[model samples]
Target: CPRFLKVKNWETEVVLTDTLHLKSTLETGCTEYICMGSIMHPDVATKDQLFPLAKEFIDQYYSSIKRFGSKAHMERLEEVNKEIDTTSTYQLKDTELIYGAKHAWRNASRCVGRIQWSKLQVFDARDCTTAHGMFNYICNHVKYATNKGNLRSAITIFPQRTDGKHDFRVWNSQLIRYAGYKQPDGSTLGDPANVQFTEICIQQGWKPPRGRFDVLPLLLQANGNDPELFQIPPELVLEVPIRHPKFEWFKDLGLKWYGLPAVSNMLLEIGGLEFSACPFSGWYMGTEIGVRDYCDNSRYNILEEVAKKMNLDMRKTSSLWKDQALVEINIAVLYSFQSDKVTIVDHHSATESFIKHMENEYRCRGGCPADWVWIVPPMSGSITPVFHQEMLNYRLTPSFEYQPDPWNTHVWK
Candidate 1:
């Protein structure tokens, strides 16, 4: 029997001791801080360059009944194949691009709430020519996604690359994520994940009020231009203030989270044609906030604080202090969001939906590839139905892929 054991994670799998060195160049100190705004995908941009002679033209083809007629599209495909140059590149029209992007969401093997992929409000901002255009588009997007706390899923795609110019994009990882300011006392002001990005913004001449919960400005960049930071209007950003269902003093702790988890700045690749900018949003699942963000040591690390407040016995390991605190924290999050009419799903309901989604995928698409590590709730693993289920993991296209962080931000592989 082999001594090496398989490690299951949310996104990837590799044989143990197979952490093969992939080459990247930079100094050790400079490696710690990275940055991103609107970035070109590596395939779209050669190192330190984007589009034009730097990029590879996509030749992957797709055809549907609506756009190019079946009879004529085949001839066009063949003619393009004969030439096999930039002209051979297949492009997605507005309708087709929207359809493909939605399918990409549906085919995202890592997602469980992908059942709503069909209803995503696809707004094509491909006509945007300036950062101002992107600013306006995102304002509209945030408003639409928030929907006065009745959140709606939406995605806005910026223009893709062409020979004449590159595309426009929003630089932030999510349209509605928090800012992290490294205070003078060696502590973080908000989400630690955004610390590197925050320092870069201050250097870039954006003013932040030095608040613990400040929302980072929207980083909007147009083709070949430096990004401009636009402050998100406070009225447009919706948030839920957490309070324990049974503890009145919990409100004094002052916890809150934005309504939407709208991820921006990832390149959406469809049929090999890469859209350099696409910002998308989905409502939150409880464990994402409760188990990871609020409780994780790298982030808030508040379980002990909440435990103290809850009066859990700290002396004995048998008390399960951390576990007891974790449940109440998650309970507070769900109760707060529901009281405010926000569209957040609990881990149990989401898992059930995922099972239903799996069944639907099984019936229609044959099998749904899933990562059980991701599908299982972070708080209670064995108690959830997903914990008992075995899943086959495989790569599926029409999927969302994460790009590397900016080289300025220091992170280890």
Candidate 2:
């Protein structure tokens, strides 16, 4: 490539205008911010604790290249590794950040569809200095990943190890997520997972529409600034309204989900640095909507309602009405997304694909770290192959990790 590439610290184009940026000599530094961030934590790591994960990451990264059977990429990684080492600090050059980000997704054990991990598009937006900058980058990532239904896995990593200099945050749990409005009866109007976040947005001067089902705005924080909220454009959010194949009345329920499940709060931990504001996206798995968001007790909790609509006997213990409702609800979710031409995967097929991903990894790496509890289908466990398979969960870097919400991590002063 070019003798020296200019990759900004942020994962998108908006971070490019900043005058103060590291001179990234390598073309692929965006992957290893995990390499750089951890020698850090959500609060903050022991060096002994930090270095091991870093070395493991580098080793696995090499293993990743070898699995592809590309000697060229392998040698290139060796060359890349020669210039990079895990210090007690997480400061990745652009190239390492770029490579490690993809690897983390590839190595993400909780994910069932890591087969496409290597196909991820990594964006460099580490230079972003403000909330508006973060907003535009997220919008770009959403539009780019949604890709009119042929969704591509993508991440827009914002500033990670710039100390407190230009720290940026996307306060929404995901780039494409619903608002959770807490109503007077202790019930939620939308996704309950976000009730606290929704309140935070309103406190930050957001005017929530208070719709039973509304898409919340993105909360942006930059330079340790007070958070600013930005509304995602309607057209950019590709939402599919839920309707059952046989239940015409379901259309009146008006439940819908965005096409992409783009998580924004998870910190991207590289070698030892923490990019607190990186947001990433992948297409939805059907039950993430049907089982978890729609039917969970704390969420929409609509299984009884759906069961009643199906006219299933709910008064008795042996009716199996709940199970029946779950199946149909999942079917409706799959059917709806398919009819709307949005990309989504059904539990059976998605689980099988997870198995394929595992088999591929096992053949190449001998062991693939995984969490069985997470990999199993949320609703129908035993029916899917993943439910029976034993799995091991291990922490490795660079990684996309669940951390404290951004609202909790920083002080605006």
Candidate 3:
């Protein structure tokens, strides 16, 4: 049963007539919406907006340290207000910034890995004033987060947006994503999700090795300048060659995934201060790479390839070939990461931990905002406890949000 409804935010009552187009449009819309989380604030920082937010954030910081309403806390609040009155915004102490980053991770509704939210290593790179400097900071971040296959949750916050014009932004979605190139016969060579970014890198004078898993270069923008491309140091990237426990032939598939899932494009909003270039990293959950990255038709699309290798009947859905390959690939991901001594979590354990997190949040705060579609694992939707539980989705401050892509919003100087 197709829902032939008129799309919102458009004047025209145009119903998508074709089934293929309808399904494609629906999925694309949902994908974009999910990436762009729930909360949004005014773009430009103003005194009225910034002062209150700064006070609220400072209050939270003091309260967390069990010093709320103390003389020092009150002085800090007054100092922030005075600074904001003079300059329209105020700077956070390093400790406040650290707590804010961790708080943002905890407030991220889409994340299933919030149990380790308080253990995040926060790097304050707000002093970085050049793209080259940004590159150096990012390399250090990669090395720390990678940690020789033992991944850690970390965030490096670059310069905050002082004005609407001078935005610091990281153009790449993930620090360790593979370059995607369009082949001669209209096929993609690497990760199809990264084709546009790979093209941008090439245009910026990066000669791609053009391999299936060539690591993408970093695109760093500083102080409203054009994004500069810097190749990620190969030594900094920790990779695991994927293989199944029971299937030796799975290694022949030439599948591999980066150990750290460092998401660079998300904006870290703390107390109305917009950190436009805060890159966060954490260990991978098995299904993220095995299912979404490998099996999704839009990305690597390796499901059929693996199914054929397993000698399964692809012609019939009743054969359950896709399901069998899915489980095998997920198994391969967990087995490979464990064998490589890399940090990774199975969906079963991850979901169970999330249930514990839910309980903790309820005890600490009155309610937790969670997106049901996202909190539920991509595969095995009903099996996870989060799938059965009812979740209320709402807005929270000191959160991560999807900024508009840099290329779209960039103003050339």
Top candidate by lDDT = 3
Per-residue CA lDDT of model 1 for 1-413, tens digit only, reads 23322323233232222111111111112122653211223124332232221121122223334433455565555543443354535455575667778877876656878878788999998788999889999999999989999889999888875541344656787787777888789988788878988887788788877776888888777774777888989999999999978999889888998888988867677655567678899899988988898999888888989999889899897999999999999999999999999999999898878867766665565556666756788888876666666565444555577654433322212
Can you list the residue pairs that collide in candidate 3? none
- Model 2, runs deviating above 4 Å: 1-91, 164-166
Which stretches in model 3 have alpha-carbon errors above 4 Å?
A: 1-43
User: Which candidate do you rate higher for lDDT, 2 or 3?
Assistant: 3
- Candidate 1 wrongly placed segments (more than 4 Å): 1-69, 72-88, 162-167, 406-413
- Minimal lDDT window, size 10, model 3: 19-28
Task: Tell me the TM-score of each prediction against the true structure.
Answer: 0.80, 0.80, 0.89
The window of 10 residues in a row where model 2 has the poorest summed lDDT is 15-24
Better candidate by TM-score, 1 or 3: 3
True-structure RMSD, every candidate: 8.7, 11.9, 9.3
Candidate 3 at residue 146, lDDT? 86
What TM-score number comes out for model 2?
0.80
Worst 10 residues of 1 by lDDT: 18-27
Q: Please give the distance, in angstroms, between residue 192's alpha carbon in candidate 2 and its true position after superposition.
A: 3.2
Best by TM-score: 3
Q: Give the TM-score of candidate 1.
A: 0.80
